[PDB]
Amino acid sequence: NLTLNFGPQHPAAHGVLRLVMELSGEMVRKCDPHIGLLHRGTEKLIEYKTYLQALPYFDRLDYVSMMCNEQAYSLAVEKLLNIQPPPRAQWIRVLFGEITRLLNHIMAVTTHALDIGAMTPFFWMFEEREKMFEFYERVSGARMHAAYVRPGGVHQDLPLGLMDDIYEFSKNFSLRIDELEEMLTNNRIWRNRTVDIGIVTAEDALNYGFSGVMLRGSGIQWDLRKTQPYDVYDQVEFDVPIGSRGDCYDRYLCRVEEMRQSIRIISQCLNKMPPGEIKVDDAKVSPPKRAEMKTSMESLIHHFKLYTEGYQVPPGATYTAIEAPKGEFGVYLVSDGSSRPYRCKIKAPGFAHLAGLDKMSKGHMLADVVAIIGTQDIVFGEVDR
Amino acid sequence: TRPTVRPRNDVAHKQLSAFGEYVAEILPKYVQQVQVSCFNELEICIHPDGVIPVLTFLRDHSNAQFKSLADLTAVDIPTRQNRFEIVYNLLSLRFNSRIRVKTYTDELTPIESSVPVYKAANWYEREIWDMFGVFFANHPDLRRILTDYGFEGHPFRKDFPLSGYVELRYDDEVKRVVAEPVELAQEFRKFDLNSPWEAFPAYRQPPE
Amino acid sequence: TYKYVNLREPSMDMKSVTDRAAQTLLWTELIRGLGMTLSYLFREPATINYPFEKGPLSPRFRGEHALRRYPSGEERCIACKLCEAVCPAQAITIEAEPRADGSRRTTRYDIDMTKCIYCGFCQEACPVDAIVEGPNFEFSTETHEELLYNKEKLLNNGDKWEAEIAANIQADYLYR
Amino acid sequence: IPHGKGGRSSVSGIVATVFGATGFLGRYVVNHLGRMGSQVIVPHRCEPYDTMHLRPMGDLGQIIFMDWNGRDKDSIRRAVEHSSVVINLVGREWETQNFDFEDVFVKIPQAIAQVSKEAGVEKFIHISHLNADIKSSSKYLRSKAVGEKEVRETFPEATIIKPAEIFGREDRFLNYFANIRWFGGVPLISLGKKTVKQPVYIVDVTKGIINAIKDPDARGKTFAFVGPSRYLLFDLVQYVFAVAHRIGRLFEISPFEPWTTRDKVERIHTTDKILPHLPGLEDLGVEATPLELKAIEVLRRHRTYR
Amino acid sequence: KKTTGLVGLAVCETPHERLKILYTKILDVLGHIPKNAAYRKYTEQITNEKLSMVKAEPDVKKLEERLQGGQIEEVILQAENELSLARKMIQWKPWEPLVEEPPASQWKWPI
Amino acid sequence: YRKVRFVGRQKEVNENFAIDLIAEQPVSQVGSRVISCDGGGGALGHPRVYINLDKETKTGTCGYCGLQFRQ
Amino acid sequence: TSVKPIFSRDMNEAKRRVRELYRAWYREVPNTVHLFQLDISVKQGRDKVREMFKKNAHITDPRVVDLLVIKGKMELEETIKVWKQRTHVMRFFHETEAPRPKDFLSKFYVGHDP
Amino acid sequence: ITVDEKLDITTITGVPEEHIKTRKARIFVPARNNMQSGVNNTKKWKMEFDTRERWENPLMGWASTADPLSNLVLTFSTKEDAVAFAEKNGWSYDVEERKVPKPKSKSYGANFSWNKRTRVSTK
Ligand SMILES: NC(=O)c1ccc[n+]([C@@H]2O[C@H](COP(=O)([O-])OP(=O)(O)OC[C@H]3O[C@@H](n4cnc5c(N)ncnc54)[C@H](OP(=O)(O)O)[C@@H]3O)[C@@H](O)[C@H]2O)c1
Ligand code: SF4
Ligand code: SF4
Ligand SMILES: [Zn+2]
């Protein structure tokens, strides 16, 4: 049998993920991919840093999420430190935490529609995506990778503006999602390109430990978005999509309705924000203000020491996970009792979502296999967990 | 006490004190310590003789579904006289409850793996072999994932230093990309950060 | 809650099949839809002519390093080493010394612009507000041997401009 | 003064200067000099792109590039004013359409037998050839021995090195064979009389320099390069077609980089196994390389498997 | 209905007696275990609690209430595996006491 | 020894120096006991610090302030 | 030792296993040397195979040798197939590395006693 | 079960390259950085290996180096498992001893005497 390794080929998509194919003439029936192109030494590296200093290495763990990562870290730290965050701060973590889902669910369709080979829905949506990075630069520090969420809540307040901008932005977005509905849904060939492909629906679709979509849209109703709270996140109203059967085209149609939920939540979140503060007030965790660290005596000693070493975290293990826009996000943060943490093991999606490519692939073509991968939305560097 | 302090609750602290109690009652063969976390988490310390059946007991029931294997990790602890610490984490689907399984071991003593019990441990179980050398029993395919092909280190333990020994370089001496002993441009200046005076009263050690 | 999408049984009668028969046979689909949504070509191309035109920014945008000083030159840096201890890449290296006047200053001052991961914490750690991430992306030399900035780049680079820097701090220091 | 391991990013004390260093010989020598770590100062003639493949041997700050002609003086003086040792390997084959080609082996080794020597250098080493004799053969082979004596007046102690014919990867003499895909493969010249010379292997060449660069006491005591075992046969030409189974030129092509039906064809068929009283290679040890093991590498033709 | 919600199963076929066999299928195997472990004390407790509400009342939809599983065909799977659970309770012996106590200082966290 | 790495590289060097530029300042005077130094402007520059000026009429540039302060 | 072994019991299921895969390496050394298109002599490969087995012969305890068996067998998984693209097999030979001195007078002129 | 009780001193090897026999470890107590007086940084045994050469990197003056270990400190619990870790991987070492001070006898009130010498002034 021919043993071609169609992978390292820089054939668009993402020139990585080099695997083997022991194809039985035309059908595959055996797929054993290799990973480890970026191992980077991540989990060993954090063992020498402090809590505030290690924080951007959670940010660079995806390619896409900037505020959904570091959402799974501060909320994994504030439980250890007996802190609730202040109420103005929680309305921003839901706002940017429900704006990164309008970055994955744009990239999760176009990049899938580029491996397939369509050109024009790649350029028709990233030109609208530019209207959104101006937000990131205006609020935090940079284009994408922002050390913005801290353990002491939000870093700083978003400036004057950004409320007649987001309302200006979000009132003209549903026309753009009505474009791709005409581009892909009512079309037949793309429907014929993906129906009854990847029919994985049994209880081994959950014994493989999958997280969401490539879950509930295939069947079993469950999510971490209204059975487990984060912040002020249950006080808004929305629904969660479910597809019919257990193929890719009934996990594709989650993502059209999923983007039709984030517009509602943003248009529901803006009406409910109170004026208030930014940081936690007790200042053993938050740094004091700049106009304060130049006047009093108490401000500097709880400033100058708070950057030489970090916080004082109590011992005892902990664990949590939140909704990453492609899955769960496990962090088993072992604390020791000093400024420097102990072991920090992460669970990212793709461990389950790509080990189950063995079950999902066989009985099918070779041209099916590239169409499988862009449905799970697998990003490397994120499989470094 | 005030705002900006996490409001704890007692309802989940009650049932998780209730549920895990009669778990040791109905298998006093493998369970050696159960503890309740002060924020609604549970540990069931298990000697690894019962690595398969206790999972197999939590694999199915009518009062405990627990069929969502989320997290297999591995934590080393030197100065314990049995170093390593395999820790699971599993999820009840119908009940919204988290519980972990802490099973210690040592290096050379193997562990009966969870291959028939769960099929999400296909790539997780191999990782501990590549990173520590904990040889699980009866796995159908033990291989090398997430490391390079020529390492002999099992790096995630503590004696392996920060850099390796294998700083790689190219020469045009013939064609090859050859290995070499490691050479840095900078020390990685190691600080000293542990302030004295014991900020924590509750976790005070036995004073001997 | 729920929603059952792509869950709809067909019509299956005499007349509505003629809407599904004219679709496949004469292609009233795929042209009314997909030949009109492409054209849609008459819109204006939103392209920036980069060597002439430039895009928007923010007043808190990061970039090139620089050092400031007081009115008539004083070296605002006091060498209190705090930017070093929070640099995640340890791109800072400072050796200080008592200068003969008596007040302490610096001797070596380094920013590994290769290693520099741009966490910008140096800008938010100096008490006397010395180092500033200056907003100019002018870069791209030709050697690895050049981007290691010594001190006499940085004071010079902090003095190619100041009115660019001094207006952005003065419009943003009230927030932080 | 030296420090630590000389694996990479060391100091090792020495500061050399290698001219030429764009051909087959001068590149491969420096690729050892950036391994032990030193201030290698290599000035090139007229080629910014033709040294691009050279740079990833010295780590960082160890190499440096300058421009020089050679008929000018200070460009050969400004660079060499801060060093310790200096070797030279400059020269080539056939006369240029613009140059003079005689004094290039006479005044150009003299142009760096200038104030260069007076500046305070030591262990200056030039290259020779085993067959460069004062006899009336050839136009290129002789007029190399003229530089062996008329420039030997300057630098009274040098240890000028004398190599035999070399074989490596991309030389001219061994690649003169098997580049002869033609309507007839003739040897030189249909006779097995004098073939062959001593093909020393290229690792032995670069190993002889680095032992001599702090030997010590190797100045004046000139050295010769032993070849393989032992003389060689006519079988070499048959050895080519048996196992082979029968850089700044121009934008399209160079008009004249020929096979040169001139005194090129005789400069190799003049063997001259010279005097064995030179020490010259085994004492500058250790160099011992056969031919039968390194022949698989350089030859490359259409079969590639069998 | 023709789809059972949770995709991957089929309504196959009859409620109210496919269950009623399988509860009683367990209870006969339940008597085989030597009674010193409390495994019998709770498992026979909930099956008699279940089967009393199972046998035998209309409708299918009413049997969903007061029996907290998924749909009724999936409630089979709630006890399908439990039959496979209790028969392996004879094979290994959890009613035996503790074995291999840890060496007296191991589950102390701060090093 | 090091003088070879910049040949044809012109040695881009600083021009002004703050080694001694304090000394060209009109050294301030008050005739009081203790003075604030929020020099460079409020909420920027060096923090507030109080200096005794009784002894060879000076303060000592406060370290932080840098400007020569005296009476 | 209150610990169960991996495969062997005591030294005799062990020492027959290290002999076992030695033949699998021994027919592999001529097999790969024309496959990975590298050019040394094949006897050097057979010397380096027995080089590796003989060095670790100072063990008087089971399940460590058995631990090396799992290490020794996993080497063949990449080896029989093509998973080491012309570099990892060349990584066995410290070829372009400068020689260690290993002599007392030779160490004394270069180095602060490394 | 296959218990097969046997006895051997566990010396593991093959995982590093050569630095078993080359180096010698050191087990000691860190004892009171005496710029201040906090005694929390007692109670934990630590380790540190041999120190080798630190030269100058001739472009900046950085402390570039060989000596690949040079930074490895672990947190031990006591003297008992201090030895047992150095032998389990098996390289040479040397052990210090814990120093605890005098208790000691200090009592105010005897600083005002009738005939003694213990008498303070100028307070
Ligand atoms: N050992 C042997 O068997 C053997 C055989 C044949 C020849 N040689 C001679 O020994 C040396 C080996 O050279 P090679 O094998 O590496 O080939 P090569 O290409 O001739 O290298 C010698 C360098 O000298 C440069 N050069 C020629 N004329 C020059 C001039 N007027 N000014 C400055 N540079 C000049 C050449 O090109 P650039 O100008 O671009 O730098 C070349 O880079 C040469 O001198 C050669 O004549 C030795
Ligand atoms: S920014 Fe602050 S820490 Fe850095 S050199 Fe200046 S005064 Fe020192
Ligand atoms: S700019 Fe970034 S990398 Fe550089 S010192 Fe500041 S925080 Fe560190
Ligand atoms: Zn002042």
Within 13 Å and on the Cβ side, how many CA atoms surround A62?
A: 26
Distance CA G4, CA B135 (A): 12
Structure tokens at E8: 């991957």
CA distance D171 to E9: 74
Look up residue A136 and give its two tokens: 């990131």
Task: Find out whether A119 and A27 touch, Cβ atoms under 8 Å.
Answer: no
Cis peptide preceding G50, ω within 30 of 0: no
Give me E74's structure tokens: 């999936």
What's the gap between Cα A376 and its chain centre?
A: 13
Q: Do the chains contact at A244 and E7, CB–CB below 8 Å?
A: yes
Question: Which method, experimentally, gave rise to this model?
Answer: cryo-EM
Q: Are D8 and B180 in contact (CB under 8 A)?
A: yes
> Distance between CA A368 and CA A362 in Å, rounded?
10
Helix (H) or strand (E) holding H28: strand H26-28
Q: List, in order, residues 6 or more apart from H94 with CB less than 8 Å away.
A: H24, H25, H26, H27
Strands D40-44 and D63-67: parallel
Any E CB within 8 A of H40 CB: no
Query: For residues D76 and D114, what is the distance between their CA atoms, to the nearest angstrom?
Result: 9
* Contact check, Cβ <8 Å, B189/C85: no
- Copy the structure tokens of residue B156: 């995630």
Residue A128 CB-density burial (10 A; 0-12 exposed, 13-18 middle, 19+ buried): middle
Please check whether residue A384 lies inside any domain of the structure.
no
Q: Is residue A170 part of a domain?
A: yes
10 Å CB burial of residue A235 (0-12, 13-18, 19+) is: exposed
CA pair distance F64, C66, nearest whole angstrom: 20
H/E stretch holding H47 reads strand H46-48
DSSP line for chain F: --TTTTTTT--------SSS-GGGS--B---SSEE---TTSTTSSSPP--EE--STTB--TTTTT-S-BB-
Measure the CA angle with vertex A377, ends A372 and A380; round to 5°.
Answer: 110
Q: Say yes or no: F47 contacts chain A, CB-CB below 8 A.
A: yes
Is residue C91 in contact with ligand 2, taking CB distance under 6 Å?
no
Tokens at A351, concatenated: 């461990």
Domain count, chain D: 1
Domain region containing G108:
1-114
Read off φ and ψ for residue C157, nearest 5 degrees.
Answer: -65, -25
Residue D20, SS3 per DSSP: coil
Separation between Cα atoms, residue H123 and residue H118, nearest integer Å: 14
Contact residues, chain B, for C85 at CB < 8 Å: 191
Which CATH number characterizes residue A191's domain? 1.10.645.10
Alpha carbon separation from D70 to D46, E19, F17, H47 (Å, rounded): 11, 101, 42, 61
Q: Is the CB of D94 under 6 A from ligand 1?
A: no
Q: Which of residues 14-53 of H touch G (CB under 8 A)?
A: 14, 52-53
The verdict on residue A219 lying in a domain is: yes
Establish whether A248 is an annotated binding residue: yes
Distances from the Cα of H113 to the Cα of D295, H104, H117, angstroms? 102, 21, 7
How far CA C133 is from CA of A97, B15, C125, H115, in Å, comes to 27, 53, 12, 71
Closest CA to A279 of A83, A135, A51: A83
3+ Cβ–Cβ pairs closer than 8 Å linking F and E: no
The C-alpha angle with vertex A80 and arms to A76 and A83, in degrees rounded to 5, equals 95
The CA distance from H106 to H117, in Å, is 15
DSSP secondary structure string for all residues of B151-208? --S-TTSSSS-SS-S---EE-SSSS-EE-----BSS---------SS---STTPPP--
Please say whether the beta carbons of C60 and A134 come within 8 A: no
Tokens 């003049």 -> residue:
D270
Range of the domain at A349: 19-376
Residue B78, C-beta contacts closer than 8 angstroms, at least 6 positions apart:
B158, H74, H75, H76, H85
Which residues, 6 or more positions from F51, have their beta carbon under 8 angstroms from its beta carbon?
F34, F35, F37, F59, F60, F62, F69
The half-sphere exposure of H92 on its side-chain side, counting CA atoms within 13 A, is 6
Range of the domain at D115: 1-306
User: CA-to-CA distance for A139 and A135, rounded, in angstroms?
Assistant: 6
Residues of B in Cβ contact (< 8 Å) with A86: 3-4
**From the annotation, which residues of C make up the binding site for [4Fe-4S] cluster?**
77, 80, 83, 87, 116, 119, 122, 126
Chain B from 165 to 194: CB within 8 A of any C CB: 186, 188-189, 191
Spatial contact of A101 and A68, defined as CB atoms under 8 Å apart: yes
Distance, CA of G98 to CA of G94 (rounded, Å): 9
Distance C110 CA to ligand 4 centre (A): 28
Task: Please identify which residue in the block is written with the tokens 């032990």.
Answer: D36
Spatial separation of the C-alpha atoms in residues A303 and A282, rounded to whole Å: 13
| A7 found inside a domain | no
- Burial (Cβ within 10 Å: 0-12, 13-18, ≥19) of residue H65: buried
Q: What is the DSSP letter of E89?
A: G
CA distance linking residue C81 with residue C96, whole number of Å: 9
Q: Strand C131-134 vs strand C148-149: parallel, antiparallel, or unpaired? A: unpaired
Cis-peptide, bond into residue A252, ω within 30° of zero: no
**How many angstroms separate the most distant Cα atoms in chain G?**
52
Q: ∠C162-C166-C171 over CA atoms, to 5°?
A: 155
* Pairing state between β D40-44 and F51-52: unpaired
Could you give the 3-state DSSP secondary structure of residue A24? strand
What the block records as the tokens of D44 is 């090139």
Asked if B touches E (at least 3 Cβ pairs < 8 angstroms), the answer reads yes
Which of these, E50, E102, E41, lies nearest to E76 by C-alpha position?
E50
Tokens 């916080």 correspond to: A311
Q: Report yes or no: A356 and A210 within 8 Å, Cβ to Cβ.
A: yes
Beta-carbon contacts of residue A249 (< 8 Å; ≥ 6 apart): A191, A194, A195, A197, A243, C6
H helices within chain A, ranges in order? 42-45, 56-59, 71-74, 87-97, 101-110, 112-115, 120-139, 166-170, 174-180, 189-193, 204-207, 249-269, 297-308, 351-355, 357-361, 367-376
Smallest Cα–Cα separation from A47: which of A342, A336, A333? A342
Residue B156: CB atoms within 10 Å = 21
Number of structural domains, chain A?
1
* CB within 8 Å: B172 and D27: yes
Alpha-carbon distances, residue D12 vs B40, D32, E88, H57, H59 (angstroms): 63, 13, 72, 12, 15
The residues, any chain, with a CB within 8 Å of residue C57's CB and separated by 6 or more, are A137, C135
Cβ distance H22 to H2 under 8 Å? no
- Whether omega for the bond prior to residue D286 falls within 30 degrees of 0, making it cis, is yes
Residues A65 and A323: their CA atoms lie apart, in Å, by: 11
Burial class of residue A83 in the structure, from the number of CB atoms within 10 Å of its CB (0-12 exposed, 13-18 middle, 19+ buried):
buried
Centre of ligand 2 from the C-alpha of residue C63, in Å: 18
Torsion, CA A280, CA A282, CA A288, CA A292, rounded to 10: 130
A197 contacts: CB under 8 Å, gap ≥ 6: A247, A248, A249, A364, A368, A371, A372
Q: Residue D248 in contact with residue D256, Cβ under 8 Å? A: no
CA distance C165 to F44: 14
Cβ-Cβ contacts under 8 Å, E111 against chain H: 44, 75-77
Chain C interface disruption, residue of H59, H62, H64, H71, most C CBs within 10 A: H62
* Structural domain containing residue C105: 64-175
Question: Counting beta carbons within 10 angstroms of the beta carbon of residue A34, is it exposed (0 to 12), middle (13 to 18) or buried (19 or more)?
Answer: middle
Ligand 3: which of C64, C90, C92 to mutate, judged by most atoms within 8 Å of the beta carbon? Answer: C92
Check whether A254 is labelled as a binding-site residue.
yes
Q: Is residue A11 part of a domain?
A: no
d(CA A356, CA A31): 11
d(CA A334, CA G42): 52
DSSP string, D75-142: GGTSSTTS-S--B-----SS--SSS-SSGGGTHHHHHTSSHHHHTT----B-B--TT--SSS--TTTT
Cα gap A320→B202, rounded to integer Å: 24
3-state secondary structure of A137: helix
Alpha helix positions (H), chain E: 18-30, 39-54, 60-64, 72-86
